[PDB]
Amino acid sequence: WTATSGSCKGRCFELQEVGPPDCRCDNLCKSYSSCCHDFDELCLKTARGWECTKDRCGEVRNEENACHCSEDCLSRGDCCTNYQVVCKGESHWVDDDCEEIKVPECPAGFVRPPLIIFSVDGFRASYMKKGSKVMPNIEKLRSCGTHAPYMRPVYPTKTFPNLYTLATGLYPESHGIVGNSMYDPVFDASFHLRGREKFNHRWWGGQPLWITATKQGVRAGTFFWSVSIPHERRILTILQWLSLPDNERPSVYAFYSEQPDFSGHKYGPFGPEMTNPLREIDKTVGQLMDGLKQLRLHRCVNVIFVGDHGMEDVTCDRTEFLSNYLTNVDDITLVPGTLGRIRAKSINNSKYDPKTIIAALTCKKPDQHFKPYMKQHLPKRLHYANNRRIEDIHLLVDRRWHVARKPLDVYKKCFFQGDHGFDNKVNSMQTVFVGYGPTFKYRTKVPPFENIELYNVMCDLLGLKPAPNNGTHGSLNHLLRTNTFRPTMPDEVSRPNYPGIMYLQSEFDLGCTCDDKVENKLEELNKRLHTKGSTKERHLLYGRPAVLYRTSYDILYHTDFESGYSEIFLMPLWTSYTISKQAEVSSIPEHLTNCVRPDVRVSPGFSQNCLAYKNDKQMSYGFLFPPYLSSSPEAKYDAFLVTNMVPMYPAFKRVWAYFQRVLVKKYASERNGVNVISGPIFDYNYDGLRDTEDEIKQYVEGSSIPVPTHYYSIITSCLDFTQPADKCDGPLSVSSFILPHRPDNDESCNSSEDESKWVEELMKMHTARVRDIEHLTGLDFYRKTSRSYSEILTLKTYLHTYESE
Ligand SMILES: *[C@@H]1O[C@H](CO)[C@@H](O[C@@H]2O[C@H](CO)[C@@H](O[C@@H]3O[C@H](CO[C@H]4O[C@H](CO)[C@@H](O)[C@H](O[C@H]5O[C@H](CO)[C@@H](O)[C@H](O)[C@@H]5O[C@H]5O[C@H](CO)[C@@H](O)[C@H](O)[C@@H]5O)[C@@H]4O)[C@@H](O)[C@H](O[C@H]4O[C@H](CO)[C@@H](O)[C@H](O)[C@@H]4O[C@H]4O[C@H](CO)[C@@H](O)[C@H](O)[C@@H]4O)[C@@H]3O)[C@H](O)[C@H]2NC(C)=O)[C@H](O)[C@H]1NC(C)=O
Ligand SMILES: O=C(N[C@@H]1COC2(C1)CN(C(=O)OCc1cc(Cl)cc(Cl)c1)C2)c1ccc2nn[nH]c2c1
Ligand SMILES: [Ca+2]
Ligand SMILES: [Ca+2]
Ligand code: NA
Ligand code: NA
Ligand SMILES: [Zn+2]
Incomplete structure (x- = not known):
């Protein structure tokens, strides 16, 4: 109820909203059906339109007019916007030369621009x-x-997710406006463009x-x-x-x-x-x-x-219908259009199964124009999962297309020719x-x-x-x-240990083997140098990453790479290495195919073991620094250290091996060398933030080795590609990715083909900012460069998008 019998006299477009049931005169009263009876008359005057004309100049003030051209209007603050142009011989702003505004030129009484x-x-x-x-x-x-x-x-x-992101600085998953339409299962309430639920403040977070x-x-x-x-x-x-x-x-x-x-x-x-x-x-x-x-x-x-x-x-004819895929289309609710969100039609239906819906929607038609994802598997750059208003099943729709549940939805709701989302x-x-x-x-x-x-x-x-x-x-x-x-840069919270040689080979009982017992003062001094960090300036170009939480980790140096090895997660947090334009790719030698080597710097108790991989029939392993890019046959042995091993599903190993064997060298050729930092990410609660130990949902069977949800790489070179990545005097150039660590390649419809036809396409889809990786890892990169800190912050928010010009 609104008592619309109060008046807007001297209240037109008042800034403070008056509470029910008193009538309103603010710029939103119409939307709430609550304006006072005389709001249109007093506040929405239209008489004589919006522009002064010569005959109106110096007119006697008539309060009925939409705007004024009388001598008093400037002091009343209500002239038509062209008053001074028509009546006082001034120019339109657009016709004036632009002139630098070096300082604010404000009227007296203005505290700030x-x-x-x-x-x-x-x-x-x-x-x-x-x-x-x-x-x-x-x-x-x-x-x-x-x-x-x-x-x-x-x-x-979409409209409201974007406007409210402009207003708050927040992703939609955090401010809560996750679409133009939403269902919140906790409120049991629906947000729509039409009607009143959308004004309730419980929708609008941040x-x-x-x-x-x-x-x-x-x-x-x-x-x-x-x-x-x-x-x-x-x-x-x-x-x-x-x-x-x-x-x-x-x-x-x-x-x-x-x-x-x-x-x-x-x-x-x-x-x-x-x-x-x-x-x-x-x-x-x-x-x-x-x-x-x-x-x-x-x-x-x-x-x-x-x-x-x-x-x-986008036109009506470019619509995919779920009724062409699903047997059970009446048991689902779809939020449709340029994205799809699916949930069960009834919470009482125990036959509802997300796994069977996803499978029925996966690579079913050659030119299929949408792709289904569980929300946690969406590219992390979208930051679109951590809100109960985002349904578990998401459809990423190709540009130019829509998705809908049934054909009758599209003609019994062509009109439109444009859309967004x-x-x-x-x-x-x-x-x-x-x-x-x-x-x-x-x-x-x-x-x-x-x-x-x-x-x-x-x-x-x-x-x-x-x-x-x-x-x-x-x-x-x-x-x-x-x-x-x-x-200021964040303070480092954990300082590293720098272990030397502390364990004999026989103290390890990891179930690993290596054919490395085939054996010089000219060369023994040199390898000791490498293990103390003599090549570190080559491979750690921008300082070591800072660890911004409390943990126990070791810096491990090698001829070809440096790493920050976590004693808690039993693997590196980061592994850093530089590949010059001139670097050569080699194979893993036959005698070393299954080689894994104890690291005599790290205790057996803080090492992975090969027996766990042998026994886990679903899980294999890969290496963070790639053996393919070793600087020499002898340096290659370092790549097989148990401290460089990480757990990888065989399907994921196809992706990772192609990146390491083919793409790193391609990037170094194209960019004049690259510096690569790679590592694991654990985000089992899909909040975009580093998991603690007690959030990890999956381990290599029988062991305490946690399974990453994603693997990242940050690939940096010189923006001026005439200088090699390791001798760059000026600004940097970066691209990065966060690949999902999945046990199949169902996301890639062409994955039966050679990796050259699908892997890089997957990597592009999972492009990332360095800042996204910072959130996911609790690491802080680029701590030691010659660049200003604000320039580095801009570099860390860069996203390489792979879109044409
Ligand atoms: C993008 O930037 C934003 C802003 O900086 C980042 O989001 C912050 O992240 C924090 C971690 O996820 C989170 O901190 C939590 O705050 C809890 C108090 O929250 C209320 O108060 C704040 C401040 O006013 C308010 O902003 C909140 O608003 C959220 O929730 C309402 C709904 O009530 C929404 O309307 C609003 O849109 C917003 O929702 C979003 O965030 C929530 C999480 O709060 C999500 O659930 C939503 O899906 C949505 O994304 C709130 O009104 C506080 O309770 C938490 O503390 C728990 O955990 C710590 C662990 O250290 C522990 O010490 C505590 O004991 C406590 O644990 C207990 O509760 C657990 C769960 O119930 C339970 O398991 C335990 O056993 C314990 O009982 C926590 O500190 C902060 O709120 C948000 N802020 C916002 C605005 O989202 C975001 O991370 C950035 N993103 C990236 C990728 O960087
Ligand atoms: O425009 C649409 N809907 C209505 C009309 O106007 C609205 C809601 C009122 N509001 C407003 O005056 O915004 C000011 C503001 C600025 C910033 Cl910078 C930040 C914020 Cl938060 C607000 C926007 C709409 C709806 C559905 C659609 N589907 N496809 N396209 C669609 C468009
Ligand atoms: Ca819009
Ligand atoms: Ca997390
Ligand atoms: Na295995
Ligand atoms: Na596939
Ligand atoms: Zn629109």
Whole structure:
């Protein structure tokens, strides 16, 4: 119940929301069906439209008009945005030369440059170039301020997951808005775009920017706008708020446009009908900037122009139907479209079985346009598993396609020609970022970055401490002229042991064998040198990784590689080695095929054993430093140390052996040498964070050797590839991956073919940031370089995407 009989007189677009049942006059009252009886009359005036004309200049003020052109309007803060242009001979902002904003030029009483976020739904990154001729205001923001060629959204590339990630710095699995539609089994409640459940605060986790600001004494404009409030009135409302007295005036504002998404769904991303929505968005930017110029705020405010996601061509005919795969299609509930999520239709059905649904959906049709995953097996870069609102079965849908349960869902719900939601590395899904103002840099292009990083920067622009989030604070310092955040590197928590030779061969009873008992002061001194770290500068290029939790581990040196060996997990946490352009690949010699060698530096009690592998009929082993890339026949023996062994399913060994035997040398040839750090990851609770010992669900049978859920590698070289990776004077270049350690290759439909036809495709799908590996391992990389720490933070957030230009 709302008592709509109160009045909006002097309350139009009030910032503080009044509680039930008193009627509202805020920018969201329409959405709650709660506005006072006279809200339209008083607050949504439209008389005489939105632009001053010559005959209106100096008019007698008529309070009925949508905006004003009377002499008093600047002091009232309610002129039409073109008032000074029409009536006072001023230029449009877009027609002025751009001139660097070296310091804020703000009116007296301004404590800080305000921030205005101008968000555009469905604005695909390539519109910035492809539509530039019809968007002169946006093109001036872009060219004169700071811009990226694109900004990467979060998955799924849907509206509310992205907007709320922009507002919070959090992945959707952490803020809880994991789709535009959701079921929460704990609440037993459903979130939909239509209706009231979506306003309940229990959906919305983390701390959005307007709450962060308010708690720290910085006032905020309200971020959401009811759909019926026209854009011209939104801009005029912002400009009016900006004319409030100092103590009442907000410092952060948001404008939202439902375009170009609205038309992109109807006409496709490049439909000829798309030009007009781009022109109309540009005209709105023009109104805001002209309005700021009138207020003498155009060299005071920071403006961010940012989208939520892009738009792909998708039509009704490119739909896969689960009814062509599943016998039991009526026993499942599907959340459909550009991603699929499956759960049981009834929790009382004991015939429901996820394993049989997955198998029925796996590589069943030659050109199949979606792939099923248990959520924990999704690429870790999507960070899309750790929330009870994310169903266990996920379908990753190919770009340009939909999935649906039955054909009748698609015609009894072609209309649409565009959609979004796909994998956030897909080029069509990328969106836009421009920052313009005194705090942003002038005429500066920055590399693409992820939208999870923006919250921290918005906090920096407002002098706020960000709530805990998934950005890496400092990684976007290069966007900013001032207000940079200068983090310190985390402190190392565990220091390593450096063991020398402490055990005789006969103390070991590991069930291992090696044909190495075939045997010089010219060469004995040299091998002792290698075991003390004489080659370490070659193989450990950026310092040893820091271990940021409490544990017991040893540094182990060798001719060709260095490692951090965990006494708790019985294997390395990391193994580091450099492969030059000139390196040669060799075979594992016949006499050494099954060779494993006790490491006389590490106790039998803290070693793996070969008997456990012999007895575990499902599990084999591989090596982290590859024997194929040994520097000499004699150095090759080090590669067979029991301290370089890790557990690997035979199916996974196909992937790993091809990476090590073929791809590392290919990368060194292409990049002029590479430094590789490889290791295990344990994330059995799929939270994206390093497991403790007591979270491990699987061991090599009969033993205490834990089985990794994934194996990672970080592959670094010189950005200037004219310099070899081990003699690089300047910035670095990195690519990394986190491969799932699975007992089959069912994810790769072509895995019966030679590894040359499918392995690298798998690796690309599981591309990762170094920061993703940091979270998963509790390690901190690149501690000793010649680079600034913020530059290193940017490097650690880099994702190599393998998408075309
Ligand atoms: C991305 O960045 C974010 C933000 O930094 C990272 O997420 C943080 O990660 C922490 C570890 O997973 C987590 O810390 C836990 O906090 C618990 C208290 O949580 C509440 O309070 C906070 C602070 O206000 C609040 O933000 C929380 O909000 C979450 O939960 C509500 C639902 O109630 C959601 O609306 C909201 O969206 C958010 O959900 C997300 O996080 C939760 C986990 O909290 C997930 O379950 C969701 O699926 C979703 O992802 C909460 O309201 C605290 O209770 C925990 O402490 C337990 O564990 C420690 C182990 O050290 C132990 O000392 C304690 O005793 C305790 O154990 C006891 O409980 C266990 C489970 O019940 C039980 O097994 C034991 O036997 C014990 O009884 C823990 O400290 C922190 O909350 C989140 N924050 C957010 C916002 O998500 C995220 O990790 C980053 N991601 C990556 C990949 O880097
Ligand atoms: O636009 C859609 N839905 C409605 C219309 O407007 C909304 C919900 C109100 N809100 C708002 O004013 O946003 C301000 C803001 C800025 C930041 Cl930077 C951060 C935040 Cl959190 C909010 C967005 C929609 C729905 C379904 C779809 N399916 N496909 N495409 C779809 C689009
Ligand atoms: Ca959207
Ligand atoms: Ca974990
Ligand atoms: Na075995
Ligand atoms: Na396969
Ligand atoms: Zn949309």
